[PDB]
Amino acid sequence: VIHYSSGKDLCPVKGWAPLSKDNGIRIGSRGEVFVIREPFISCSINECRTFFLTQGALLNDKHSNGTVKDRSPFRTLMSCPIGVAPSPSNSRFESVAWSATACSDGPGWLTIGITGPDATAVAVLKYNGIITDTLKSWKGNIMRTQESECVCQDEFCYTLITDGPSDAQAFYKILKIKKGKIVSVKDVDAPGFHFEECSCYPSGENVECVCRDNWRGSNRPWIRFNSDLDYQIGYVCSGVFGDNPRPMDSTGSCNSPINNGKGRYGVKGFSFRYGDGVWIGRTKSLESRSGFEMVWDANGWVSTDKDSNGVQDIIDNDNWSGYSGSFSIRGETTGRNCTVPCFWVEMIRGQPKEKTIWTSGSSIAFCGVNSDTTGWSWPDGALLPFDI
Amino acid sequence: VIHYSSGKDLCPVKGWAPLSKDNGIRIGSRGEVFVIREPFISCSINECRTFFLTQGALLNDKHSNGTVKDRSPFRTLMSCPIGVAPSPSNSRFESVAWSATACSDGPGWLTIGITGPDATAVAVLKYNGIITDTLKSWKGNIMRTQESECVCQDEFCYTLITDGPSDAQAFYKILKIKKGKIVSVKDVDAPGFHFEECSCYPSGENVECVCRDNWRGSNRPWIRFNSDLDYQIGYVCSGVFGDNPRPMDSTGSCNSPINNGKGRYGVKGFSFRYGDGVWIGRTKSLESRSGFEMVWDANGWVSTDKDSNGVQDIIDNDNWSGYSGSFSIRGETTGRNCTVPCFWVEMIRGQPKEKTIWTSGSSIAFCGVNSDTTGWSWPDGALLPFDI
Amino acid sequence: VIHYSSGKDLCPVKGWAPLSKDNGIRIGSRGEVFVIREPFISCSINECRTFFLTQGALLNDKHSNGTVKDRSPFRTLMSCPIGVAPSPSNSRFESVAWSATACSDGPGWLTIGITGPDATAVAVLKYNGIITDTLKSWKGNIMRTQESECVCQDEFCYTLITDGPSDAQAFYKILKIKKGKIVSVKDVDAPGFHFEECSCYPSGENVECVCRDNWRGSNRPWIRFNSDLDYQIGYVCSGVFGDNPRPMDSTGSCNSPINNGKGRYGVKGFSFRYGDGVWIGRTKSLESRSGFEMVWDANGWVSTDKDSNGVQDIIDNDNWSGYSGSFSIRGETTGRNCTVPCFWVEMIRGQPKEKTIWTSGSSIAFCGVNSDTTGWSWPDGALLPFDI
Amino acid sequence: VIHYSSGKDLCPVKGWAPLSKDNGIRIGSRGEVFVIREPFISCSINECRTFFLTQGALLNDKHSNGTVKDRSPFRTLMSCPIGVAPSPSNSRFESVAWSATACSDGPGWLTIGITGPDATAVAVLKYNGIITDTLKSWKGNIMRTQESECVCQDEFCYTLITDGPSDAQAFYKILKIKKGKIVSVKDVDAPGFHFEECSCYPSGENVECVCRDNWRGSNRPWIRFNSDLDYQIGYVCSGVFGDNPRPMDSTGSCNSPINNGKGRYGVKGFSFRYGDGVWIGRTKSLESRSGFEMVWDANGWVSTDKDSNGVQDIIDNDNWSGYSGSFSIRGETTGRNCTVPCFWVEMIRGQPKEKTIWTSGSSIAFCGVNSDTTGWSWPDGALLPFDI
Ligand SMILES: CC(=O)N[C@@H]1[C@@H](O)[C@H](O)[C@@H](CO)O[C@@H]1O
Ligand SMILES: CC(=O)N[C@@H]1[C@@H](O)[C@H](O)[C@@H](CO)O[C@@H]1O
């Protein structure tokens, strides 16, 4: 009935409590389930939904051959209630796209789907399913975005967009959106920096995003910005590197990418700042997308220690993980005076690791909680290969 | 909460932005999906839905043999949210029909299904699923209609209906409907003209429709009419012929059908007038239903040039297309002071082209947008033949 | 928002217009569809739904073996929007029952499911899914009911129930229900009469039902009653016999069963009185459940002519039909000052006629309409046998 | 619109009327249905839903191998309308859990899912899908709960939780929850007693629960408590033992477990107190989970007779039963001044009894009713083995 207002800080967090798990791939063994990627959650005052990307093909069907390009004309953004299998029967259509972001300003939904050829990609903005605006590739090199929820406060929604090489220097922009309309956008001058698939959240009148450096950083770059779009950037200080691949924990860097031969590629991830502290979610393996854990490093944000203060296990290393992202449940939902931070974890199955003709994901999600919790292993559970 | 009012012009349009794609046929490879035809969109103040026709048979099932007549007692009009597969699980029933039209007057839905034997076809009118009226064949020769959404303004909804030979002179009627009730109807005297499957839209107190000539016109006939039903007809002036089949672009004709050996048959299509200008959506091939593009011809409506001013690619020629139609998103939806023009494209797969025992469609849709866009190819994506 | 009020007569009717067809069996060839029987429609001010009975088994599955008794502990009453396949995905649960009836008093739903052993059957009454009352077998011989919608006026809902031999004299009761509560019930003294599966409707302060005589009547028995339950009975005068089996049209009887060697068994059916006139829906065949037609006999109700005044074809004789019933759309729905009469037709496929291990139904429905219509053939369309 | 208030007694009950049956396993033979356990019902003022536990695997699919632990990271709590098959298409996600409870305080839903490793299990509390609180294992030995609905009155919801050996003495706690928040909790000192899977209900300002003793009681232990959490415990006096396994009916014990060599293990069950009387629902067999019946023992609660006063058959002994539980429909729903007691019955199929690689359940439910009823047999109906 009202919009998400700003000026709120994240809630106190001791440990993470399980919110949802869908077993999408296990169910897909026989049921009708879309081949997914990017199962990211986003909530409005009344609902939480999982958004994802599909090639428009179902599990255990030839059309899941995955010979196809990640960026194809068939890829669309869809959504469904959290916890349920992303089947064609309980999934809503969002937009044609091979890269996107979505979020609620409170009473409605903002979706941004980027589709088209690589040289001239276009983002189609929509407020409640209605095209409200569009942004075209300003650099001509695979324009892309969050693949995680954008953030809204005081009727305004913000996001980050990248265009350029995943090889080196790329170009970035922050957007300010009102009911699907683009009200100003800022160019981000971050020489040396590489921003991709940002996991954002709100923190008192500002918007903080912890992203992915695919150029040469094993540590993650972050950016915080104004409703005017005044910004600040840097990498997460902490030696508890949070990307993948990554070297062993060494002395970190708060303003530059730490390569160490493993800083090259990466994976979408998130982190939650808490003053000088930081919560780092990351894989267990240093080179593969397996296992996942949440690390609380009291200095994370200000220091460069490789020393933390607690680790909660989410998925053990004998199991597969994948994309990770942040989303928040607001005070307008929970009668609270703070924002509840949560995160979803993609659990990739199939190619290139396992021997299948396909590649899909399943998910689990967790939320803040300033009470007791437990670590454990909540893997995908599918038994591959399938009837391949 | 209120009805769609008149006196509004189409919004400014630079290029077309993707709105939805369903991948219905790709999903049908394993999922439960109806064999479709005519996937046309129609919106109410709060929702957009895709209406389509089914023989009541699912893809990859013997009942899809398609040996059956297009006009069978099994054919029904159904609808579903846009973007989702037209499965029996997410499709609503509209009416028994082998030819139809539907549209919203704002707060409700008007559906018209034509069923029965060829000699005595009957249109059953319904407002919100309740039979409100009926019209019977007045010529006794396959009475039929739009196969695209009708148009409503100031509580009144209008449509066009044809009865007679697809071979030559046919007979036409314009209807005026109020809450499913027929308030007057007009006979259209168009000697030399052949109107079929009209793609209509509203334009300030009037209703413009660009239809299909199956007799001998490679160019398309149009008609514009009053709320009193005073009308005007003619063909689209432009040399950029918009039907299929069609000869190469030559000098057009604003008041008569241009045959050139290819003016015979045809395909459902649409066009959007803009003063002396016109937006022409058409196939790429001159003789097959493949490829699709949107052409902006500044004189389209007044001149006969074969010269246009821009072409946006939708589906390339190596891929299949099919029926095309118009639908509009009103100001009561978008806070705008104009109407947003949009269009859907049917992508036929199977017979007679491909080697299958069936024939179905998939869809993609686009909307106006006075911002940046991109052309590309958004084909059906299904890999035929199926388990045939 | 308000209840269905009484004091309304049926609307004028020239012919019958198609309302819905589901193709349930054709879709069941591959999709998930319950094996049905009794697909009867019932509407509330805002919605029309099809109620049916299932053994809890799907088409093309071993559990559809139909070796099972019609009256089994697995049989339940369910419902779904009209026109859609009675799949487990779009069907709502109503009640455990092997015989039932349902109807809306306007704002809510009344369902009556009869289940249990033959000697001690019990009807469980529910208003909006909540058990409101119960009635037990008062004769101890397969207590049963309408298998068609009951009728409600001024908050009160009425139905008919039978207990006793289908072989000869049976015992009957009329009920008066208020919000699921039984407010009085009357015993019907009809010696010589045999009432089963009544197809009722409202007609100005009264409730008229045309039922089925399984004892020895080829013509149909009827009953009309007060809100006090004062009643009158008799058979439909007309020589245009409306049951199945039945002899050729001869001179009818207004107060007794006409046997003629074919008056034995029967099939559920309906008729609509209109003064001295009557609309008779019946099969085409005199001995099998095939073909269906609507006959208008101006004297039907008062005379015994075998002469009618018009016949509209619904399903031709080369095709299968089955149960038939009545339902009405009220003035509170249609802005009309009269009741719109409608009827649904069950189209049985499989055993005992066709060679399958199962037996199911599909449906089509029609409504009043005082405008133009057309007869035709709208059969089930399934191609048996199935993967049997 | 309002909350469930206290101070109400159970309604008068003569016999039990069938409310719902789902045939989930029969439908699962071909349709998409989750492998279930604990299909317990819980209602809010406007709706009744069946909650259940799934391993996230469908019937007739390899992932149903059931080689997996009951407590796995894949197990989740889900819900759906009563009577419908627990398919992925009509089931809502509730929470990640291998043990849970749920209930409505009137306008909303409270769900409690317990997940994680055995040594450190955690209950995640949620009000309307939003994590509101958490409780961790205080004894470190498989913390678990009701597996039946909790009870709410005057905005407060109560439940029982166990932690410790199923072998002997265990430790118990009663909780008081307000909108998902834990407002105080009490330790239950019950030396000699063993409480597990309690079937609770409200009875005038108090909450009565009849549970399961897995240590050495063939009779069932009960507990009643205050909104302050002042409590009283004991076993059900009656000689009509209500657990399984159990010895033949002997003289019972109101304050201690009656072993008799069969008091060891057990099964979830319920009972309804009525003054000195009690309604006992139990299996027919004394050692297997087969058959089910409801027994009315006028002294049940106060005496130790093996003499009852009436028995209603639900499922005969030639058929399988399983978990049993209680749920109530409040006065805020039924215009009544009392609470309507109801109960659901799980009907386990497969392992370890039958020869399949899986184990699932189906359900039937009944409600109070102070009118006529009938006993009978309403088994699961599935024909095993499946395509195994
Ligand atoms: C199960 C199947 O069809 N696998 C095929 C494979 O045989 C072929 O080499 C490849 C490339 O087109 O596409 C799929 O992976
Ligand atoms: C896969 C299949 O059954 N194809 C049949 C074909 O063999 C037969 O000639 C034809 C005409 O009845 O109907 C289908 O096309």
Ligand SMILES: CC(=O)N[C@@H]1[C@@H](O)[C@H](O)[C@@H](CO)O[C@@H]1O
């Ligand atoms: C396809 C199939 O299983 N048919 C069987 C049949 O073989 C058996 O004689 C009968 C009686 O139990 O049950 C079904 O009709």
Ligand SMILES: CC(=O)N[C@@H]1[C@@H](O)[C@H](O)[C@@H](CO)O[C@@H]1O
């Ligand atoms: C149908 C099937 O696959 N059954 C297998 C069985 O062969 C194997 O021994 C067991 C243990 O892993 O798992 C299932 O029960």
Ligand SMILES: [Ca+2]
């Ligand atoms: Ca990196």
Ligand SMILES: [Ca+2]
């Ligand atoms: Ca032509």
Ligand SMILES: [Ca+2]
């Ligand atoms: Ca008879």
Ligand SMILES: [Ca+2]
């Ligand atoms: Ca025991």
